[PDB]
Amino acid sequence: GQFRVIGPGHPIRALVGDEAELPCRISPGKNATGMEVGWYRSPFSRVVHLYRNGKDQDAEQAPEYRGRTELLKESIGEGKVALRIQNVRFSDEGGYTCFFRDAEYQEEAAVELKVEDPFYW
């Protein structure tokens, strides 16, 4: 085996109508720009976002995420990425799984999203 994939040890907190950033990275950090990086949605494992061969693969993500997601690559050269989901809604709450795949090697990490409507604060 090679690297492990890890996410934050806390849930991500987002507000309805705003953006949420779900981070994940490989450890130890190394260049992931050339790897396949993906995010899937619990519990049917629908694809939230898939990056491969240096491109976001719009056609491979589930229809509902089209136009709502971006993979932030600022730190991908150091093995870290963040899935940015726009216009968050309560239905986005829950579990997500991130994965980094290098050739035949792949690892994953679980990320949880909590959502609140600030109007009701």
UniProtKB/Swiss-Prot annotation:
Disulfide bridge map: C24-C98
Residues with attached carbohydrate: N31
Tissue: Found exclusively in the CNS, where it is localized on the surface of myelin and oligodendrocyte cytoplasmic membranes.
Subcellular location: Membrane
Assembly mode: Homodimer.
Role played: Mediates homophilic cell-cell adhesion. Minor component of the myelin sheath. May be involved in completion and/or maintenance of the myelin sheath and in cell-cell communication.
Similarity comment: Belongs to the immunoglobulin superfamily. BTN/MOG family.
Name listed for the protein in its UniProt record: Myelin-oligodendrocyte glycoprotein
Organism the protein comes from: Rattus norvegicus (Rat)
Primary gene name: Mog
Range covered out of full length: 28 to 148 of 245
